[PDB]
Structure formats: C-alpha cells, structure tokens
C-alpha cells in the first residue's frame, strides 16, 4: 500500500547501493565460467 494507516506517506524504499553493478558483475563472470565448464566437459565426454 502507498500510504500508512494515519495517512502519512511511507518512507522511501532503500535501493541497494550499486545494485546493478553487483548483479551484472556476478552473473557475467559466472555465465562465462558456465560456458568454459561445458567446453572442457563434452570434449572430455567423447574420450571415455
């Protein structure tokens, strides 16, 4: 809800400091590592 019970306006929500930086810098270096872990897996799968 927007307003509180009395009628006042709720406080500004706290956005995470440097949010998208933390997001796009833990999804990108773990999306690449998610690729490199697969390349050297299939290329190892055809051996055995």
Partner 1 sequence: SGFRDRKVMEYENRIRAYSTPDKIFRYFATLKVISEPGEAEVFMTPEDFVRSITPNEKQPEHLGLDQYIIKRKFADEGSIFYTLGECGLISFSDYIFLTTVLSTPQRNFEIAFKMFDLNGDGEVDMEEFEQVQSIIRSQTSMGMRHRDRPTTGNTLKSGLCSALTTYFFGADLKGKLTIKNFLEFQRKLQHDVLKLEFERHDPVDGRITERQFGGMLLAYSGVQSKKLTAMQRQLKKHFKEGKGLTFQEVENFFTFLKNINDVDTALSFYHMAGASLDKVTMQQVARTVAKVELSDHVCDVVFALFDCDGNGELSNKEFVSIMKQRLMRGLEKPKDMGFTRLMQAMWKCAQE
Partner 2 sequence: HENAATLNDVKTLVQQLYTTLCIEQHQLNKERELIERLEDLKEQLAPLEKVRIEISRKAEKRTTLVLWGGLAYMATQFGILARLTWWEYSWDIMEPVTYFITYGSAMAMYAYFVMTRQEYVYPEARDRQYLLFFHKGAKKSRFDLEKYNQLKDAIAQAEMDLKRLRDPLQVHLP
Tell me which residues touch partner 1 (CB under 8 A). 42, 45-46
8 A C-beta contact, residue 36 and residue 42 = no
> Is residue 44 at the binding interface for partner 2, with CB under 8 A as the rule?
no
Q: Which residues pair with 9 in a beta bridge?
A: 3
- Residue 36 or 46: the one with the smaller Cβ distance to partner 1 is 46
> Is residue 8 at the binding interface for partner 2, with CB under 8 A as the rule?
yes
Task: In angstroms, give the least distance from the CB of 18 to partner 1.
Answer: 29
Interatomic CA distance for residues 24 and 47, integer angstroms: 36
> Is residue 16 at the binding interface for partner 2, with CB under 8 A as the rule?
yes
Residue whose tokens read 């307003």: 3
């Amino acid at each position: 809800v927007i307003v509180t019970r009395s009628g006042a306006i709720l406080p500004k929500p706290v956005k995470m400091s440097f949010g998208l930086l933390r997001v796009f810098s833990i999804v990108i270096p773990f999306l690449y590592v998610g690729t490199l872990i697969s390349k050297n897996f299939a290329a190892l799968l055809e051996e055995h």
